[PDB]
């Protein structure tokens, strides 16, 4: 059974999920496992919220997992954890050894093989190849699809893929059976899920994800099969499952993922249910922010006709003045308006610029 819970940002999805798991803890404390699957950075946040109840103040039946911890768990049972683990640096070290010997076979990167920054670039590309379920053989396949067709840029491309294919297929052979890749757990999890039984008859919730890698995808649809119930929380606006979103619509990401998921659940003949959240939950007391969220996309955007309080833009002489000015604001909020530090959050597109100063 698959449930699609969708709506715009601040519609109350996450709360709705938290409360449910909580009542479910309230009703059957020792019931079948409840798996809350969120992004890695959202884990500790939900752990604190779930356990926040007057009744229980904690949980046993329910657990908060990222794709990693979930894999780690299922594996401490189904097996594979005693297998040695390789760090990204350990892979690069291996790679640099490979680039050496197989160097002379490169059709393009022969000159770039030397540079120490080329090992990190390959390591990142191979990582991406696993996450997207593309084996060395696959890369090999593609590498010769662009071979002997004349679009310069295609030829060049097929050459890179050829070189990568080598280092790739040569890494696989050096890691065969005796070493474990960081991105190997998800594939290992996906194929161990079927015979992991304590996840059978289990209710699971996914939330906080905009997209899913083919590898992560391979885990979800394998959960859709063996799990009793699964709910997908997606931030979007009445997405369609017959068409992928156009390039220029706000919910391209989440809308895309819904479409795929829904189709996978369709071919997998599951009982499907829908929940569309319309009204605002987060912004009911804040009209401005409620407007910003609603009119964010439309070019035929209606100007907000009301007073300014919640929303404000501000310019500083420099990042110091900026942080230093925000620092006093936070103090004004806590001391005057009676907030708590835990209610404030400051975001930076490039945190590296403010990190030191902050």
């Amino acid at each position: 059974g698959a449930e699609f819970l969708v709506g715009r940002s601040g519609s109350g999805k996450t709360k709705l999920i938290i409360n449910s798991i909580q009542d479910e803890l309230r009703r059957a404390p020792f019931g079948k496992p409840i798996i809350f699957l969120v992004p890695d950075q959202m884990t500790f946040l939900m752990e604190y919220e779930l356990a926040k109840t007057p009744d229980m103040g904690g949980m046993i039946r329910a657990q908060v997992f990222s794709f990693s911890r979930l894999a780690w768990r299922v594996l401490q049972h189904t097996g594979g954890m005693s297998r040695p683990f390789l760090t990204s640096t350990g892979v690069q070290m291996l790679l640099r050894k490979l680039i050496e010997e197989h160097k002379q076979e490169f059709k393009v990167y022969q000159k770039a093989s030397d540079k120490s920054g080329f090992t990190a670039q390959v390591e990142r590309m191979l990582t991406e190849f696993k996450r997207y379920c593309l084996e060395p053989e696959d890369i090999r396949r593609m590498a010769e699809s662009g071979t002997a067709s004349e679009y310069r840029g295609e030829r060049v491309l097929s050459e890179k893929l050829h070189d990568l294919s080598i280092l790739y297929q040569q890494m696989e052979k050096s890691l065969a059976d005796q070493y474990l890749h960081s991105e190997d757990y998800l594939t290992l999890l996906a194929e161990h899920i079927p015979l992991a039984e304590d996840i059978k008859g289990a209710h699971i919730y996914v939330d906080g994800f905009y997209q899913f890698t083919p590898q992560e995808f391979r885990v979800l649809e394998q959960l859709m099969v063996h799990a009793e119930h699964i709910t997908f929380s997606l931030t979007a606006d009445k997405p369609s499952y017959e068409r992928e979103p156009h390039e220029l619509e706000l919910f391209r990401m989440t809308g895309k993922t819904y479409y795929r998921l829904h189709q996978k659940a369709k071919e997998l003949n599951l009982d499907i249910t829908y929940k569309e959240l319309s009204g605002t939950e987060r912004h009911t007391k804040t009209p401005e922010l409620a407007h910003l969220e609603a009119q964010y996309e439309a070019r035929p955007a209606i100007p907000y006709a009301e007073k300014q309080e919640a929303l404000t833009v501000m310019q500083a002489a420099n990042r110091r003045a900026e942080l230093e000015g925000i620092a006093r604001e936070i103090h004004a909020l806590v001391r005057e308006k009676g907030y708590r530090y835990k209610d404030v959050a400051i975001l930076a597109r490039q945190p590296e610029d403010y990190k030191d100063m902050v």
């Binding site: 393009v108 990167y109 000159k111 770039a112 030397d114 540079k115 120490s116 920054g117 080329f118 990190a120 670039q121």
Partner: protein, 49 residues
């Protein structure tokens, strides 16, 4: 497209080029651009050698 468009100093363009075709010449991707100071300080060193 304004964010993906090429509008910048010539140096800013050159950088985009180097990043893309670095493998044609001898240049380490992730290469760093030294300010005119440390660069000169390196000149002084190699010179003395």
């Amino acid at each position: 497209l304004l964010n993906r468009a090429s509008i910048s100093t010539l140096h800013s363009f050159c950088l985009q080029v180097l990043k893309k075709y670095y493998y044609l010449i001898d240049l380490d991707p992730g290469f760093r651009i030294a300010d005119q100071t440390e660069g000169e300080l390196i000149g002084d060193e190699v010179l003395d050698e």
